[PDB]
Amino acid sequence: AMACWAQSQGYNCCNNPSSTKVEYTDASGQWGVQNGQWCGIDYSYGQNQGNESCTGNGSYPCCNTCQATYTDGDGDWAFENGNWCGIKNSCKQQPQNNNQ
Numbered sequence: 001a002m003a004c005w006a007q008s009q010g011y012n013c014c015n016n017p018s019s020t021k022v023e024y025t026d027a028s029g030q031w032g033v034q035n036g037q038w039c040g041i042d043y044s045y046g047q048n049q050g051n052e053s054c055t056g057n058g059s060y061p062c063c064n065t066c067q068a069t070y071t072d073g074d075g076d077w078a079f080e081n082g083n084w085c086g087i088k089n090s091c092k093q094q095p096q097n098n099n100q
Contacts, residue, residue, distance in 0.1 A: 001097065003046025005029060005041055013046065014039030018057040044075050047089055049096035056086020066091030 004013030006029070014020045014034045020041050024031040043057055043062040054062030055075040063085035068076030076087035 001014065001045075001047055001065045004040055004042040006031065006072050012037060012039045014030075014041055016053065017041040017045055018053040044089070049090045049092045049094065051088060052092035054086055056084070058086075061085050063087055 002013060004011070007013060009028070011031070014032055014037075016034070017032075017040075019093050020032040020034050020039075022030040022032045022041050028040070031038065032041055033039075041081065043053065043055065047053065054064075056062060056077065058074055060083065063078045065080050065081040067078050068087045068091075069079055070077045074086070076091075078085065078087050
């Protein structure tokens with residue numbers, strides 16, 4: 001739960017970036033205020049495989065399958081239900097982050 005590219009400068013990770021409002025955008029990426037705190041929008045900011053979110057939230061829906069036939073600059077991707085959906089963050093690894 002800590003791998004946002006915004007922190008590299010000093011900012012913090014914007015929890016639930018898959019639904020965060022990006023009122024800002026520079027050459028660093030995207031930024032938004034969540035819960036009264038500045039943070040970049042990193043769908044893959046470093047969240048465990050606890051099914052916290054899904055990939056492809058940039059425009060398409062979630063796949064639900066852990067079969068990423070293709071990976072892009074936004075994570076992994078798969079073809080499910082005859083649609084281009086992203087792989088669920090839970091479909092990454094099992095030992096994601098120690099037991100709480």
